[model samples]
Target chain A: PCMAKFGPLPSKWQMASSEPPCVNKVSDWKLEILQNGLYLIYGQVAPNDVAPFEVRLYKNKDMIQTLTNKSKIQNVGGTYELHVGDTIDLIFNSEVLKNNTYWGIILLANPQF
Target chain B: EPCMAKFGPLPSKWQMASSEPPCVNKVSDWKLEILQNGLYLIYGQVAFEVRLYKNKDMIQTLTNKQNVGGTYELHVGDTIDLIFNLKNNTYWGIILLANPQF
Candidate 1:
């Protein structure tokens, strides 16, 4: 199974785990898929201050899902069938509290038997 | 096998997506009955706070600016439900992740 977790810091998200299968490209902001499968993409943001903002999940450059709210802590996620060359990234519109914001992906099942 | 469901904003009660040998049953408009004992990934997106109840007690509170996610051990006959204020465009779901009895 492919699984990875990321934490927000130093202007770009960093890999929080050494787990294999999920590859972080040259840019720490992007995760490249190495296997084809149904993946559970999930994330959470716990801002230090309460303010309106948006957290977006992107498939390559196209926005696939977004969470818009003004609460203190928020969560967003979904399942998608991904393949090799498919990349996942996230964008946050507010200042993320260090160590409190996280993102993750897990391979739930393979598409091809 | 995994189970999940997504619903629009408005209903205080949510429904489970049907699958073979169903893992959960809708007990009422606001409650769901677990059919298997296992650890499940429960998650969702919402604009406000939502409380999760297991049987008659609250288990987790979703404080959402937009999303919430967690894992919990559940058992057969355990009833689950959520309570929250209404908002536009929101959804929640669960997926059975592991069963030790297997």
Candidate 2:
């Protein structure tokens, strides 16, 4: 079958389906599925001078979730989940991402059946 | 199978005995020890990270890389979720244990 990995460096990345790909530049990334059919979404959406940096997560071309600097301003410590075949897209709307390694990861996971 | 044990500082300690059969993820300090097998934790944050000094170099590791993995602040008899799916073919670890206090 196909394969997938993490990080801006190189992660055999792939899109099996269910989510779309990320947009902006990202830093380091890691993933772990604690259960089946369930997933975890983590990492920092770095402050970009480009402004309107949106951290969008896609599930096979379709937009499943979207996170940005302004949108995530109010929510603190609030996390979410995802499924397999999903794509993680991080794009700095105005420009590319800030540094090379900000910190963040999208989980292609599922909860227990 | 990692070594598993339940260490409650006292009988009033419900942190180590909320789940069924009673068990935890770390022997030292931790957030949500094995909370939902690393996937679906009620909540994982706010001092949930463990703080035990195993080697004076122990770092407070964040376990909520997953959206569903976070330290949840639950009260007594709060109806926390208990799950086990060995026969269900979801997890692959040693005998799942929920070691709790009496």
Candidate 3:
């Protein structure tokens, strides 16, 4: 319905925790649907190497893939295309407790189909 | 503004940069547009920041600035940081590369 550039306006970062203790991480990060649209995502997970972790993308209760230190270049990140009614989760996992370090993942939003 | 003495000397080293291609899952028409010297404009997407490093050495901090191109011009290195985030239904894709003299 609209082909206008919608963002790069009045922006802020809604950071889901990427730290240790499992209680603080981007586990089950979701987006709600308010319109018929695509939830365009461009994101990254910052792991300080204090511990190894994995980033998993899911839609409708299924594993998308593991996004982390698995690439040939030894870096971690990627983009995703999510629908308006889609149920998504970005699960960040680590099996250890570490010092006072923090990290997070980010996403872009668009209200259309 | 806050006390600099208590939190003096912030750590210069941090980790950022994505070897996993931004094209890994391209499904959006978001990009950065050149506005003018020392100024960059991102259309349909917001810009965010992350630390960039080359050979495990920090060359740039994640300090938010409108003219990131100028900062990259001064710090000529291979470090890059392009992170993304979301807030208030708007998505942001951060791109800070070591580009000089544009």
Top candidate when judged by TM-score against the true structure? 1
Identify the CAPRI category of the predicted complex in candidate 2.
incorrect
Residue B62, candidate 1: C-alpha displacement in angstroms: 3.8
Q: Fraction of native Cα contacts kept in each candidate?
A: 0.00, 0.07, 0.00
Best by lDDT: 1
| lDDT order of candidates, top first | 1, 2, 3
Please give the interface root mean square deviation for model 3, in Å.
15.4
Q: What is the DockQ of each candidate?
A: 0.07, 0.07, 0.02
Which window of 10 residues has the lowest lDDT sum in candidate 3 chain A? Answer: A1-10
> What's the TM for model 2?
0.35
Residue-level lDDT for B14 in candidate 3: 20
Candidate 1 lDDT for residue A40: 83
DockQ of 2: 0.07
Q: Can you tell me the DockQ of model 3?
A: 0.02
- By TM-score, is 1 or 3 better? 1
Instruction: Please provide the root mean square deviation of candidate 1 (C-alpha atoms, Å).
Output: 7.6
Off by over 4 Å in 3: A1-28, A49-53, A70-81, A95-113, B1-102
